Design an enzyme around this catalytic site. Structure first.
Site, PDB file in Angstrom:
ATOM      1  N   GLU A 238       0.829  -1.198   0.000  1.00  0.00           N
ATOM      2  CA  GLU A 238       0.000   0.000   0.000  1.00  0.00           C
ATOM      3  C   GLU A 238       0.864   1.249   0.000  1.00  0.00           C
ATOM      4  O   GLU A 238       1.740   1.402   0.851  1.00  0.00           O
ATOM      5  CB  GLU A 238      -0.917  -0.012   1.221  1.00  0.00           C
ATOM      6  CG  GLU A 238      -1.859   1.176   1.311  1.00  0.00           C
ATOM      7  CD  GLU A 238      -2.662   1.193   2.593  1.00  0.00           C
ATOM      8  OE1 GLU A 238      -2.721   0.169   3.305  1.00  0.00           O
ATOM      9  OE2 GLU A 238      -3.247   2.251   2.889  1.00  0.00           O
TER      10      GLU A 238
ATOM     11  N   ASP B 253       0.440   5.048   0.511  1.00  0.00           N
ATOM     12  CA  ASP B 253      -0.423   6.147   0.928  1.00  0.00           C
ATOM     13  C   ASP B 253       0.197   7.461   0.483  1.00  0.00           C
ATOM     14  O   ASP B 253       0.920   8.113   1.234  1.00  0.00           O
ATOM     15  CB  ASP B 253      -0.660   6.112   2.438  1.00  0.00           C
ATOM     16  CG  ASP B 253      -1.407   4.864   2.876  1.00  0.00           C
ATOM     17  OD1 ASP B 253      -2.276   4.396   2.113  1.00  0.00           O
ATOM     18  OD2 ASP B 253      -1.136   4.357   3.984  1.00  0.00           O
TER      19      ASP B 253
ATOM     20  N   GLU C  77      -2.833  11.104   2.845  1.00  0.00           N
ATOM     21  CA  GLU C  77      -3.849  10.956   3.877  1.00  0.00           C
ATOM     22  C   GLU C  77      -3.868  12.273   4.618  1.00  0.00           C
ATOM     23  O   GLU C  77      -2.860  12.666   5.201  1.00  0.00           O
ATOM     24  CB  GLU C  77      -3.507   9.802   4.816  1.00  0.00           C
ATOM     25  CG  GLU C  77      -3.810   8.437   4.220  1.00  0.00           C
ATOM     26  CD  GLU C  77      -3.482   7.300   5.162  1.00  0.00           C
ATOM     27  OE1 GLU C  77      -2.284   7.035   5.391  1.00  0.00           O
ATOM     28  OE2 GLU C  77      -4.429   6.660   5.662  1.00  0.00           O
TER      29      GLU C  77
ATOM     30  N   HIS D 181       3.825   1.542   2.537  1.00  0.00           N
ATOM     31  CA  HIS D 181       3.727   0.335   3.369  1.00  0.00           C
ATOM     32  C   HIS D 181       4.198  -0.856   2.547  1.00  0.00           C
ATOM     33  O   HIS D 181       3.757  -1.039   1.408  1.00  0.00           O
ATOM     34  CB  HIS D 181       2.283   0.033   3.780  1.00  0.00           C
ATOM     35  CG  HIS D 181       1.663   1.035   4.702  1.00  0.00           C
ATOM     36  ND1 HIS D 181       1.348   0.739   6.011  1.00  0.00           N
ATOM     37  CD2 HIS D 181       1.236   2.302   4.490  1.00  0.00           C
ATOM     38  CE1 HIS D 181       0.777   1.789   6.572  1.00  0.00           C
ATOM     39  NE2 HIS D 181       0.694   2.750   5.671  1.00  0.00           N
TER      40      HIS D 181
END
Ligand SMILES: OC[C@H]1O[C@@H](S[C@H]2[C@H](O)[C@@H](O)[C@H](S[C@H]3[C@H](O)[C@@H](O)[C@H](S[C@H]4[C@H](O)[C@@H](O)[C@H](O)O[C@@H]4CO)O[C@@H]3CO)O[C@@H]2CO)[C@H](O)[C@@H](O)[C@@H]1O
Ligand SMILES: *[C@@H]1O[C@H](CO)[C@@H](O[C@@H]2O[C@H](CO)[C@@H](O)[C@H](O)[C@H]2NC(C)=O)[C@H](O)[C@H]1NC(C)=O
Ligand SMILES: OC[C@H]1O[C@@H](S[C@H]2[C@H](O)[C@@H](O)[C@H](O)O[C@@H]2CO)[C@H](O)[C@@H](O)[C@@H]1O
Ligand SMILES: *[C@@H]1O[C@H](CO)[C@@H](O)[C@H](O)[C@H]1NC(C)=O
Ligand SMILES: *[C@@H]1O[C@H](CO)[C@@H](O)[C@H](O)[C@H]1NC(C)=O
Length: 438
Positions: free
Chosen positions: A212, A214, A217, A228
């Protein structure tokens, strides 16, 4: 899951750009699709629900296989039910929609065509977009991110999955979520328990793991950029607490990195940089540039961030924490940050930069969502202290200006019912091809 035939599924058009070294840019005719969990799920032989609120119909869904055979995802009224509106290059997501019933939040994916997600390999490229977070208070998260979901939504090797990408099937992330109704072509009714707090959710026996990225955010208070890692970058199925991630009793026991290597300017010591009236002024729209630099072998070795607002190119803020320097995500930064903050380096444990390189090579799907947080009230993103009982003097504890009592869903789903996010003007291309300014 099956294809429902009671409501047409029309993916709202959304344009985005591809730029070349120049930097000339051309326009792609993309489409957005609502994630399968938000949809009406009903019997293939009529209108009877397979799932309502937080509860499965056990006659239609006596087990995970039979449930997938019996149950169909149907079309979505994007604006009317979910508060999702796409116009030109802009995508607006509303937090609360008071339709025939109340809807909270949404998760959407960018589509190449009716039955395929667009995929991205951003190695030696940058991804750029404009965002307006001015309507996002404490406890909200407008997330724009990437996960290596199967481009076809999994249909090629999942016989009971006919719905696929057309109906937003196939989600996975680094939290190995067990709240998904369908994972890898099977339902998740077995082991399901309704959530203790959310009327709309629960947790099944299995979770959906993958890497993942990101990219974004954020709300009007704080923002975080967080890759991640994962042992296997594409979807894998996990069971129970062995999943790890947010809703496990053993967070770090799984095959993914649930924490990532994060850069939040405020958490890294600069409280003047991002927020209302700050250097990046969240009262108004701004451009977010994220660059994915490689070594000589083509492996990711650095993620850089620039902002553009009022025509000014704004470098990412320097981390000011003693022992954690620089303004980008590198192995040196990630190692130092985890050591200094005293956090477990699960990022490194599951393959760090090489894992993210492999994620890009597999192909990333773009996710655009808006959500509140039933686990931690988004305090990890925007609180004066997370954990809430930790010492704010300890480096890494403070992440924003929000109180430790902020962001409780039952509170903010009323008080922040007007909240929304707008993502717009997505551009992808070689480094420095997607933006300009002084
Ligand atoms: O059943 C009829 C009833 O439906 C709701 S729609 C409802 C779905 O039924 C439910 O499955 C999902 S669960 C959802 C959760 O609410 C949400 O907080 C998380 S947010 C998630 C975010 O999207 C990601 O970007 C991020 O990386 O992780 C975040 C935390 O997981 O997603 C969950 C699904 O994955 O909730 C929806 C909305 O409540 C209708 O709204 C209602 O009117 C109708 O009666
Ligand atoms: C999905 O989760 C369910 C629920 O935990 C798993 O169901 C178990 O499966 C085993 C093996 O078939 C059975 O012996 C158990 O009786 C099931 N338990 C329950 C509570 O139903 C299922 O195995 C998981 N699926 C995958 C692919 O991992
Ligand atoms: O689980 C919610 C949230 O977690 C963060 S990781 C977070 C750790 O939970 C916390 O122990 C440590 O002190 O701070 C880190 C960074 O905020 C994760 O990045 C995010 O994906 C997730 O939603
Ligand atoms: C479950 O579905 C069956 C089959 O369609 C239907 O007869 C029944 O009314 C449903 N039960 C509940 C509790 O929703
Ligand atoms: C891109 O621009 C940034 C900021 O101006 C600069 O640091 C970098 O050297 C440039 N990179 C390339 C490949 O031109």
């Amino acid at each position: 899951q099956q294809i429902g035939t009671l409501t047409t599924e029309t993916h709202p058009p959304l344009t985005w750009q591809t730029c070349t070294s120049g930097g000339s840019c051309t326009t792609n005719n993309g489409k957005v699709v609502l994630d399968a969990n938000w949809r009406w799920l009903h019997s293939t032989s009529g209108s009877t629900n397979c799932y309502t609120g937080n509860t499965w119909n056990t006659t239609l869904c006596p087990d995970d296989t039979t449930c997938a055979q019996n149950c169909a995802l149907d079309g979505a009224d994007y604006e009317g039910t979910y508060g999702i509106t796409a116009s030109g290059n802009s995508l607006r997501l509303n937090f609360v929609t008071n339709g025939s019933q109340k809807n909270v939040g949404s998760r959407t994916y960018l589509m190449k065509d009716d039955t395929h997600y667009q995929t991205f390999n951003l190695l030696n490229q940058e991804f750029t977009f404009d965002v307006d977070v001015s309507g996002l208070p404490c406890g909200l998260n407008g997330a724009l991110y990437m996960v290596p979901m199967a481009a076809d939504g999994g249909v090629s090797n999942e016989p009971n999955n006919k719905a696929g990408a057309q109906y937003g099937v196939g989600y996975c992330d680094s939290q190995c979520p067990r709240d998904l109704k369908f994972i890898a072509g099977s339902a998740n009714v077995q082991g399901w328990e309704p959530a203790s707090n959310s009327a709309n959710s629960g947790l099944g026996g299995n979770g959906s793991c993958c890497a993942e990225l990101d990219i974004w955010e954020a709300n009007s208070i704080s923002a975080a950029l967080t890759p991640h890692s994962a042992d296997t970058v594409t979807q894998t199925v996990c069971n129970g607490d062995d999943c790890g991630g947010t809703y496990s009793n053993d967070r770090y026991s799984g095959t993914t990195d649930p924490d990532g290597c994060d850069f939040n300017s405020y958490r890294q010591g600069d409280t003047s940089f991002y927020g209302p009236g700050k250097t990046v002024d969240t009262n108004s729209k701004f451009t977010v540039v994220t660059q994915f630099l490689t070594d000589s072998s083509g492996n990711l070795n650095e993620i850089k961030r620039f902002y553009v607002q009022n025509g000014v190119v704004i470098p990412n803020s320097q981390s000011t924490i003693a022992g954690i320097s620089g303004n980008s995500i590198t192995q040196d930064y990630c190692t130092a940050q985890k050591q200094v903050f005293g956090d477990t380096n699960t990022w490194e444990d599951h393959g760090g930069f090489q894992s993210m390189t492999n994620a890009f090579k597999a192909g990333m799907v773009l996710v655009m969502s808006l959500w509140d947080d039933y686990y931690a009230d988004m305090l990890w993103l925007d609180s004066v202290a997370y954990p809430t009982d930790a010492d704010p003097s300890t480096p890494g504890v403070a992440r924003g200006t929000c109180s430790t009592t902020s962001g409780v869903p039952s509170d903010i789903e009323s008080s922040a019912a007007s909240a929304y996010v707008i993502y717009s003007n997505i551009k992808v291309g070689p480094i420095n091809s997607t933006f300009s300014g002084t």
